[PDB]
Design an enzyme around this catalytic site. Structure first.
Site, PDB file in Angstrom:
ATOM      1  N   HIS A 350       6.387  -2.314  12.100  1.00 37.95           N
ATOM      2  CA  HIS A 350       6.646  -2.096  10.672  1.00 37.95           C
ATOM      3  C   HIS A 350       5.902  -0.726  10.165  1.00 37.95           C
ATOM      4  O   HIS A 350       6.021  -0.446   9.249  1.00 37.95           O
ATOM      5  CB  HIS A 350       6.613  -3.084   9.793  1.00 37.95           C
ATOM      6  CG  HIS A 350       7.189  -4.436  10.085  1.00 37.95           C
ATOM      7  ND1 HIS A 350       8.380  -4.760   9.681  1.00 37.95           N
ATOM      8  CD2 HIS A 350       7.006  -5.424  10.824  1.00 37.95           C
ATOM      9  CE1 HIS A 350       8.912  -5.613  10.060  1.00 37.95           C
ATOM     10  NE2 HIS A 350       8.016  -6.490  10.658  1.00 37.95           N
ATOM     11  N   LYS A 541       6.875  -0.605  -6.040  1.00 42.10           N
ATOM     12  CA  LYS A 541       6.764  -0.797  -4.711  1.00 42.10           C
ATOM     13  C   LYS A 541       5.105  -0.989  -4.564  1.00 42.10           C
ATOM     14  O   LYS A 541       4.454  -0.745  -5.853  1.00 42.10           O
ATOM     15  CB  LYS A 541       7.143   0.161  -3.662  1.00 42.10           C
ATOM     16  CG  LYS A 541       6.452   1.453  -4.171  1.00 42.10           C
ATOM     17  CD  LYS A 541       7.348   2.595  -3.941  1.00 42.10           C
ATOM     18  CE  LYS A 541       8.008   2.677  -2.612  1.00 42.10           C
ATOM     19  NZ  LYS A 541       9.596   2.850  -2.564  1.00 42.10           N
ATOM     20  N   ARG A 542       4.481  -1.573  -3.594  1.00 42.88           N
ATOM     21  CA  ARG A 542       3.117  -1.731  -3.709  1.00 42.88           C
ATOM     22  C   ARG A 542       2.497  -0.413  -3.651  1.00 42.88           C
ATOM     23  O   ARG A 542       3.069   0.671  -3.286  1.00 42.88           O
ATOM     24  CB  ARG A 542       2.474  -2.505  -2.255  1.00 42.88           C
ATOM     25  CG  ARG A 542       3.134  -3.951  -2.018  1.00 42.88           C
ATOM     26  CD  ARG A 542       2.297  -4.960  -3.205  1.00 42.88           C
ATOM     27  NE  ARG A 542       0.891  -4.677  -3.022  1.00 42.88           N
ATOM     28  CZ  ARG A 542       0.296  -5.771  -2.225  1.00 42.88           C
ATOM     29  NH1 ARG A 542       0.717  -6.564  -1.808  1.00 42.88           N
ATOM     30  NH2 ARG A 542      -0.996  -5.547  -1.987  1.00 42.88           N
ATOM     31  N   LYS A 547       2.789   6.230  -0.151  1.00 43.31           N
ATOM     32  CA  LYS A 547       4.330   6.131  -0.915  1.00 43.31           C
ATOM     33  C   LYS A 547       4.351   6.934  -2.250  1.00 43.31           C
ATOM     34  O   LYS A 547       5.065   7.260  -2.618  1.00 43.31           O
ATOM     35  CB  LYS A 547       4.092   4.541  -1.591  1.00 43.31           C
ATOM     36  CG  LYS A 547       4.520   3.393  -0.582  1.00 43.31           C
ATOM     37  CD  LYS A 547       4.514   2.139  -1.017  1.00 43.31           C
ATOM     38  CE  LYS A 547       4.693   0.980   0.104  1.00 43.31           C
ATOM     39  NZ  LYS A 547       5.801   0.989   0.582  1.00 43.31           N
ATOM     40  N   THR A 649      12.856  -0.807   1.770  1.00 39.49           N
ATOM     41  CA  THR A 649      14.224  -1.778   1.745  1.00 39.49           C
ATOM     42  C   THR A 649      14.337  -1.685   0.286  1.00 39.49           C
ATOM     43  O   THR A 649      15.617  -1.926  -0.324  1.00 39.49           O
ATOM     44  CB  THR A 649      13.751  -3.257   2.023  1.00 39.49           C
ATOM     45  OG1 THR A 649      12.704  -3.507   1.483  1.00 39.49           O
ATOM     46  CG2 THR A 649      13.672  -3.323   3.741  1.00 39.49           C
ATOM     47  N   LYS A 653      18.136  -1.758  -2.277  1.00 34.41           N
ATOM     48  CA  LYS A 653      18.416  -2.498  -3.270  1.00 34.41           C
ATOM     49  C   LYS A 653      18.839  -1.458  -4.414  1.00 34.41           C
ATOM     50  O   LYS A 653      19.768  -1.935  -5.168  1.00 34.41           O
ATOM     51  CB  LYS A 653      17.169  -3.180  -3.892  1.00 34.41           C
ATOM     52  CG  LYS A 653      16.723  -3.929  -2.652  1.00 34.41           C
ATOM     53  CD  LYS A 653      15.209  -4.702  -3.221  1.00 34.41           C
ATOM     54  CE  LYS A 653      14.564  -5.301  -1.908  1.00 34.41           C
ATOM     55  NZ  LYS A 653      12.996  -5.750  -2.490  1.00 34.41           N
TER      56      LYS A 653
HETATM   57  O1  LIG Z   1       5.178  -4.654   4.350  1.00 39.88           O
HETATM   58  C1  LIG Z   1       4.755  -4.239   5.221  1.00 39.88           C
HETATM   59  N1  LIG Z   1       3.503  -4.473   5.812  1.00 39.88           N
HETATM   60  C2  LIG Z   1       2.738  -5.412   5.166  1.00 39.88           C
HETATM   61  O2  LIG Z   1       3.041  -5.945   4.046  1.00 39.88           O
HETATM   62  C3  LIG Z   1       1.288  -5.346   5.688  1.00 39.88           C
HETATM   63  C4  LIG Z   1       0.850  -6.846   6.023  1.00 39.88           C
HETATM   64  C5  LIG Z   1      -0.720  -7.093   6.617  1.00 39.88           C
HETATM   65  C6  LIG Z   1      -1.388  -5.918   7.085  1.00 39.88           C
HETATM   66  N2  LIG Z   1      -2.416  -5.871   7.583  1.00 39.88           N
HETATM   67  O3  LIG Z   1      -3.108  -4.794   7.986  1.00 39.88           O
HETATM   68  O4  LIG Z   1      -2.773  -7.035   7.852  1.00 39.88           O
HETATM   69  C7  LIG Z   1      -0.590  -4.588   6.998  1.00 39.88           C
HETATM   70  C8  LIG Z   1       0.468  -4.394   6.295  1.00 39.88           C
HETATM   71  N3  LIG Z   1       5.362  -3.328   5.804  1.00 39.88           N
HETATM   72  C9  LIG Z   1       7.054  -2.702   5.410  1.00 39.88           C
HETATM   73  O5  LIG Z   1       7.829  -3.434   5.961  1.00 39.88           O
HETATM   74  C10 LIG Z   1       9.034  -3.255   5.477  1.00 39.88           C
HETATM   75  C11 LIG Z   1      10.149  -4.134   6.202  1.00 39.88           C
HETATM   76  O6  LIG Z   1      10.476  -3.539   7.621  1.00 39.88           O
HETATM   77  C12 LIG Z   1       9.352  -1.675   5.883  1.00 39.88           C
HETATM   78  O7  LIG Z   1      10.750  -1.475   5.640  1.00 39.88           O
HETATM   79  C13 LIG Z   1       8.027  -0.826   5.170  1.00 39.88           C
HETATM   80  O8  LIG Z   1       8.355   0.659   5.629  1.00 39.88           O
HETATM   81  C14 LIG Z   1       6.881  -1.224   5.671  1.00 39.88           C
HETATM   82  O9  LIG Z   1       5.814  -0.376   5.247  1.00 39.88           O
HETATM   83  C1  LIG Z   2      12.228  -5.218  -1.908  1.00 38.12           C
HETATM   84  C2  LIG Z   2      10.657  -5.205  -2.404  1.00 38.12           C
HETATM   85  C3  LIG Z   2       9.727  -4.582  -1.917  1.00 38.12           C
HETATM   86  C4  LIG Z   2       9.698  -3.524  -0.715  1.00 38.12           C
HETATM   87  O1  LIG Z   2       9.956  -2.274  -1.502  1.00 38.12           O
HETATM   88  P1  LIG Z   2       9.719  -0.715  -0.727  1.00 38.12           P
HETATM   89  O2  LIG Z   2      10.022   0.290  -1.863  1.00 38.12           O
HETATM   90  O3  LIG Z   2      10.665  -0.812   0.479  1.00 38.12           O
HETATM   91  O4  LIG Z   2       8.353  -0.701  -0.287  1.00 38.12           O
HETATM   92  C5  LIG Z   2       8.335  -4.809  -2.240  1.00 38.12           C
HETATM   93  N1  LIG Z   2       8.115  -5.753  -3.307  1.00 38.12           N
HETATM   94  C6  LIG Z   2       9.320  -6.418  -3.754  1.00 38.12           C
HETATM   95  C7  LIG Z   2       9.020  -7.624  -4.715  1.00 38.12           C
HETATM   96  C8  LIG Z   2      10.571  -6.407  -3.339  1.00 38.12           C
HETATM   97  O5  LIG Z   2      11.313  -7.032  -3.821  1.00 38.12           O
END
Ligand SMILES: O=C(NC(=O)c1ccc([N+](=O)[O-])cc1)N[C@@H]1O[C@H](CO)[C@@H](O)[C@H](O)[C@H]1O
Ligand SMILES: *Cc1c(COP(=O)(O)O)cnc(C)c1O
Ligand SMILES: O=C(NC(=O)c1ccc([N+](=O)[O-])cc1)N[C@@H]1O[C@H](CO)[C@@H](O)[C@H](O)[C@H]1O
Ligand SMILES: O=C(NC(=O)c1ccc([N+](=O)[O-])cc1)N[C@@H]1O[C@H](CO)[C@@H](O)[C@H](O)[C@H]1O
Ligand SMILES: O=C(NC(=O)c1ccc([N+](=O)[O-])cc1)N[C@@H]1O[C@H](CO)[C@@H](O)[C@H](O)[C@H]1O
Ligand SMILES: *Cc1c(COP(=O)(O)O)cnc(C)c1O
Lengths: 809, 809
Positions: A350, A541-542, A547, A649, A653
């Site tokens: 990811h 988004k986070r 970002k 994602t 949406k």
């Molecule tokens: O949400 C993500 N990552 C985390 O929440 C995450 C969790 C744990 C750690 N960690 O280092 O433990 C790092 C990132 N990655 C996200 O997953 C989405 C689904 O494929 C992608 O579309 C986004 O581009 C990506 O940034």
């Molecule tokens: C869809 C969604 C995300 C992911 O958003 P990105 O802009 O792809 O980082 C994060 N948080 C929530 C609550 C979502 O519904």
């Protein structure tokens, strides 16, 4: 009321009302005189839950009789959100329940707001798992989601004095009507101990035991009567005065494993508790998988009946754990065990950002999981022997590909472990998958080309369209039917309505209604009015530097300065909304949140600005809030530095809900622009190649500061305390970062971004043309349905065929 | 099958079966193919629970409409045992459910064994609270039981190598179908902080807050359609990465308050956690009481609508807490507040032994509850002023009566606090109440004679006769009807059947069947056969030196030595059963358990003994086990040193179930002998006066050792390792205690005890006469019904009239 919400027949409504009263009485022990709003929500939840039971039992019985290949999706995160409305949608009971509650004198929408979100995820990765479960059930796959039942999910965010404050998310406080504990499947998980090498194989002894108790939650497919299962494990101490009392209290230590979700989604932290969580879910899940496999012993057919998908490297220990069970317990020879392991496991990556990759210190694995470390070393030795044979003499390659990284403290690179032990590795967007092959995984791609694939992300059309935007779903259905809800590609038929005056008017009306609805919500639950007629500019988004919420901030300040410069000039009114949580230990992210609120404090109270510009920070962004704000947005901000957002994602949406997109050619944005046509997208900024060229010669932010007057003014305002009167140097860290250590080149895309934003405002001034472009976006968003994504995983990775055929009942 | 178990009508059975299947399906999510035994138990529990709902809602609604004086029974212990059968008994559904489950192909008795005991108590004190709740509901009193919902009750006892091992009692593991959480009544409880004296009264500030969430459990009256409530409080932390993670994990600290029941029933331990539990239950309960009072503001009528009964001093903080609320929050003047407090509170004492009395260190109260300590000092000052005025110049009396004890560390005597702040103080047996007035509370009795009362204990006839011994209840009912079940005095009518050959035969048959039933149970769940024809000699109760399980042991060894001396002489066969748990830190009690098993190891394997003598230690004695063993006993051992057992209640359970009693004139034994006639009781040993005379001249155990050959032999066997070959000095602590520091004079009653036991054996040889004496005991056990006890509390302490009138439905 609305046809896409199902039929509200007399017999069905009558039945719902009586079962509602039955639960209020017998289940809640209340009568209409002392019943609280929460009591009514639970009565409704139980009533809807009752309709799932038969289908749930029949589905699982069905899988036992047909014995299909089972898909196991392992994830440390499942960002589910609320369940009530989604369940009604998939069972076609929404209108009936709406009528039934109405007749009882209750407002169903009011009751839905009482349910707590199941926020067992951080963001994109966790939400992807959730959309995937919905799609797998809708496509008739024998799929199971396996994870941890955190008693505390992602923290609730409170904004105090403009700063983020974290509050525990005690989501199970009032109970969870959707889950069902399955004590008969409680399993032991081992930790610590030591390895003993006897005459016949190694043996892991003197371990500490923690029990894993599963809780099942139903996952209903869209009107196909299929109900799959999401099984989440909860930690329990084994059952076996000061000393006695303390011993009982110390049970919490063991049970702390499933206590809370780690909120760091920016930087990997090698914390022991997190490692325990990762092994805990993997150990219990694999035992459950093997049990079900045997209850359906040559493991040669194991890969034909089992597929394990690893969501990131978090559950990567499944690889050495499967080897451990096969070699140490089942007594299979290594080579055969390895063959089975590789054939059943697949890994999804990811991100390409270094700091997010898991690299566990060897000393930690050595103490907690001694046998697994030995298995990992053996895997590495055999793998590197293959590399040496394929690239003789290439000593540097051996160092780069090793699962073991040398240096300060030896660490195990979990991504390398995943590639070596999986038959498929995929990126989540075309550009991301390509970057994986060209950069961080290049060596592996050269050794095993066949393993690398792409599976562009998607979102479920049910929660992200029908559920959150029924008004839009209805006007679409009136013209092309309801079939598109489970076959989103059909939205292309809308292309023949781009010139339909009636349709154009309805699309615009729906958006206006959503904005009014959200503009109201804002005042009710929060405290400020917003001009419903302004352009809703949204970035949710986070909070992360990559970002670039900061770039958005620079544009907002630019707009404010321009108004101040020429107060009496006309400017398209905008309501800029930014929201998202910051990881607790991410200092810069917390400073960005403060900056956003600080900007709002100045802009929102400037008499000269009036209601031409408003800056609002959306507090506690979560799935439930996303369902409200997204349908109301006009402009979607997807402005990550090219090459950093794997897919995204949230972007999908927004596209599906009638918002136009301003963004960089990053992640899935590239494919979205390709599907809709670049002329129907607001693309700007450096492309991946441009970023590379800049890195080659060296990024110097000063150059932009010296050549762009408007940018210089903004930086001087930040530095002089214009946005923090009482605290002049409050944002010194932000200015210092932007000027001397910006890994994401915010200044480099500033000019093109501002120019692009001007073109957005120009189009908004022409309602009819803005709407026609919107129609072109909605009409081509079909590729981004997670049903398409899952169908590809199924055929190209898992080796199973999707089924749209419904089931009995 | 048996008429006293209710009617099994066609419509009722049909309804039960369908609701059972409804719960198995919708509630358990199972079908008859995958349903586990536990699934069936829960389906049955839900089906029975459904029948309680209407009555529960109607009862509470009834109290709101009529607004009767409410009785609040505060206890840190509620030894409930299982709920399923008791609920069926009180609703007259036992036969119907038995038939219904039978028709479904299930054995109801088998399903009942699956329910976990609600062991929220240590022994007598906790069980008394349980019998009281049953009687209060049966007598139509608006009564509420308030306590703590411990997630771990009294530990499960395992016997390993003859030693007691403690295991956590995770009784809520599979869920509790009987409780209902009431989140709308969550209340805050304060701890620590400091007191601020402002212009208008004191203020308790800077406190730490812990939330109290109530869980309600229904308490059904005997076939009168009344369902009262037992409300138990659970501790919850307020909702407001390493630091973030740790903060969430630290929530366990606050929630530990309701984690576990303190198992020390022998020695008071001033532990902070226990003090927190005591204030926690008192603080939340009083707020709830006041809420209900206001929802029905002059507190002058408070005592007319509220009665608070303190079960021992454990909830004594209710006195200063009520004052705190009335003075600090309601702003009433001290004198008026004190008047209200005294008029609403009443205290029950359960022992005269010094080590069991609560005396909290001042420094502990000072830190945890600063305001309460100030209130306590003020109470003491005013009280001592009254004493000084009544007994001018009596300086020693002032020291003895003070609530504050001086010395090493200042302590607050909670018993003194309770007497000063209650309008009634009662003992639990005539002899105990008299001793209170003559010894430990003499000074208080002289100051306020009117406050001291007696309320002899009792047991509920429903759980202790109808439920556990249906066979006996049935033969009694066939001759005198069923009215005695709620009017136990009617058992006297059986006196006219003492010469009835038919009745004599049935009484003996029932006992034989119970013994066979228990003799079997022993083999199934444990591993040894026992001669069903031997006399069942039973002593079950917590292990304590004052209860003298050791004296019993001396008799067993005596019997064994006599057999060995003259192997071929006839002796009445006996199965000696001893059971009970020992407090974890009570060394001597744990040594007594080891001695019992050690004796069994020798006696049970001696060829010469054969099956003429067996010594069995009953593992994990608890309410459920008591319901099994008591109905099977022939002889009840109640041999505490005269003046040490306040009342005893196990003694009453045995009398009601057909066992003859061998005991000292201690506690309620005196009244039992008085009711049945001394000739129908096996009384032996020193009376209270005799013990006093011995203490006056000094107890010298050596004198008995030198004058009794058989006793000397026993002590030599213990000392030489006859019962511990591998560990010769294993019991040196026991011998040393008996010979030099026996506070309970075991040797002093040895001779009379052995002689008395010989007379018991003599009577057992004459079946007909043994049974006639049994009939005389059962016929006069009526006074010991807790319905009688509660009626006395109601009229003489609470000021309310009992009601036998049933309710609608
Ligand atoms: O949400 C993500 N990552 C985390 O929440 C995450 C969790 C744990 C750690 N960690 O280092 O433990 C790092 C990132 N990655 C996200 O997953 C989405 C689904 O494929 C992608 O579309 C986004 O581009 C990506 O940034
Ligand atoms: C869809 C969604 C995300 C992911 O958003 P990105 O802009 O792809 O980082 C994060 N948080 C929530 C609550 C979502 O519904
Ligand atoms: O814990 C519960 N107890 C009872 O329902 C209950 C009912 C009747 C009686 N009774 O004594 O009659 C006791 C408990 N009910 C629970 O209430 C939750 C909130 O609505 C639901 O989500 C759970 O599924 C339900 O089991
Ligand atoms: O937790 C529960 N969940 C469900 O019953 C349930 C039913 C259906 C579905 N569903 O998705 O269809 C989900 C959960 N049930 C609980 O099972 C316990 C043990 O029998 C009972 O004591 C509780 O009162 C009951 O609420
Ligand atoms: O069970 C009792 N006490 C305790 O369990 C107990 C609990 C706590 C502490 N403590 O010191 O904390 C001491 C004793 N007392 C018992 O209460 C019965 C009911 O009236 C009486 O009949 C018995 O004679 C008495 O010993
Ligand atoms: C009745 C009972 C007691 C009290 O027994 P005594 O002999 O009065 O001490 C203790 N434990 C249990 C389980 C009981 O049922």
């Amino acid at each position: 009321q609305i046809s896409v919400r199902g039929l509200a027949g007399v017999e069905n409504v009558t039945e719902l009302k009586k079962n509602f009263n039955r639960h209020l009485h017998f289940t809640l022990v209340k009568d209409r005189n002392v019943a609280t709003p929460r009591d009514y929500y639970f009565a409704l939840a139980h009533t809807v839950r009752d309709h799932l039971v038969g289908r749930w039992i029949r589905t699982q019985q069905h899988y036992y009789e047909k014995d299909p290949k089972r898909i196991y999706y392992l994830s440390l995160e499942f960002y589910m959100g609320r369940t009530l409305q989604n369940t009604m949608v998939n069972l076609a009971l929404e209108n009936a329940c709406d009528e039934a509650t109405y007749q009882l004198g209750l407002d169903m929408e009011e009751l839905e707001e009482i349910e707590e979100d199941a926020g067992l995820g951080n963001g994109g990765l966790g939400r992807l798992a959730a959309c995937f479960l919905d799609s797998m059930a809708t496509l008739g796959l024998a799929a199971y989601g396996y994870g941890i039942r955190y008693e505390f999910g992602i923290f609730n965010q409170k904004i105090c004095g403009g700063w983020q404050m974290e509050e525990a998310d005690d989501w199970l406080r009032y109970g969870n009507p959707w889950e069902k504990a399955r004590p008969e499947f409680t399993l032991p998980v081992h930790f610590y101990g030591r390895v003993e090498h006897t005459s016949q194989g190694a043996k892991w002894v003197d371990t500490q035991v923690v029990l894993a108790m599963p809780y099942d939650t139903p996952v209903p497919g869209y009107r196909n009567n299929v109900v799959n299962t999401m099984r989440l494990w909860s930690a329990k101490a084994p059952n076996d005065v000061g000393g006695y009392i303390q011993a009982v209290l110390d049970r919490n230590l063991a049970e702390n494993i499933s206590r809370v979700l780690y909120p760091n989604d920016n930087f990997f932290e090698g914390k022991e508790l997190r490692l325990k969580q990762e092994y805990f879910v993997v150990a219990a899940t694999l035992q459950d998988i093997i049990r079900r496999f045997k209850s359906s012993t040559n493991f040669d057919a194991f890969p034909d009946k089992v597929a394990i998908q690893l969501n990131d490297t978090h559950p990567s220990l499944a690889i050495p754990e499967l080897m451990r069970v096969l070699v140490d317990l089942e007594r299979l020879d290594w080579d055969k065990a390895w063959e089975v392991t590789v054939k059943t496991c697949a890994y999804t990556n990811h991100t390409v950002i270094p700091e997010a990759l898991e690299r566990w210190p060897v000393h930690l694995l050595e103490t907690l999981l001694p046998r697994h470390l030995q298995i990992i070393y053996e895997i590495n030795q055999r793998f590197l022997n293959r590399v040496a044979a394929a690239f003789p003499g290439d000593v540097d390659r051996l160092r780069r590909m090793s699962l073991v990284e040398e240096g300060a403290v030896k660490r195990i690179n979990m991504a390398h472990l995943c590639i070596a032990g999986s038959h498929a590795v995929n990126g989540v967007a075309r550009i991301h998958s390509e970057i994986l092959k060209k950069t961080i995984f290049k060596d592996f791609y050269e050794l095993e080309p066949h393993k690398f694939q792409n599976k562009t992300n998607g979102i479920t059309p049910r929660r992200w369209l029908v559920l959150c935007n029924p008004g839009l779903a209805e006007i679409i259905a009136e013209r092309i039917g309801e079939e598109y809800i489970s076959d989103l590609d059909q939205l292309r038929k809308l292309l023949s309505y781009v010139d339909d005056e009636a349709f154009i008017r309805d699309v615009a009306k729906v958006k206006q209604e959503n904005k009014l609805k959200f503009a109201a919500y804002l005042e009710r639950e929060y405290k400020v009015h917003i001009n419903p007629n302004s352009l809703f500019d949204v970035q949710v988004k986070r909070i992360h530097e990559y970002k670039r919420q900061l770039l958005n901030c620079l544009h907002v300040i630019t707009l404010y300065n321009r108004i101040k410069k020429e107060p009496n000039k006309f400017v398209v009114p905008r309501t800029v909304m930014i929201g998202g949580k910051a990881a607790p230990g991410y200092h810069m992210a917390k400073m960005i949140i403060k900056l956003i609120t600080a900007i709002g404090d100045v802009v929102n109270h400037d008499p000269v600005v009036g209601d031409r510009l408003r800056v609002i920070f959306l507090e506690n962004y979560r799935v439930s809030l996303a369902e409200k704000v997204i349908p109301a947005a006009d402009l979607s901000e997807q402005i990550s530095t090219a090459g950093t957002e794997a897919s995204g994602t949230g972007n999908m949406k927004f596209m599906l809900n009638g918002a136009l997109t301003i963004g960089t050619m990053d992640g899935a944005n590239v494919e979205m622009a390709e599907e809709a046509g670049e002329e129907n997208f607001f693309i700007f900024g450096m492309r991946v190649e441009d970023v590379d060229r800049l890195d080659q010669r060296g990024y110097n932010a000063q150059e932009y500061y010296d050549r762009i007057p408007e940018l210089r003014q903004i930086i001087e305002q930040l530095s002089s305390g214009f946005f923090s009167p009482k605290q002049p140097d409050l944002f010194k860290d932000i200015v210092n970062m932007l000027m001397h250590h910006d890994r994401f080149k915010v200044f480099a895309d500033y000019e093109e971004y501002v120019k692009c934003q001007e073109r957005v405002s120009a189009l908004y001034k022409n309602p009819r043309e803005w709407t026609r472009m919107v129609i072109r976006n909605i009409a081509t968003s079909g590729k981004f349905s997670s049903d398409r994504t899952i169908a590809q995983y199924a055929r190209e990775i898992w080796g199973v065929e999707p089924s749209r055929q419904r089931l009995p009942a």
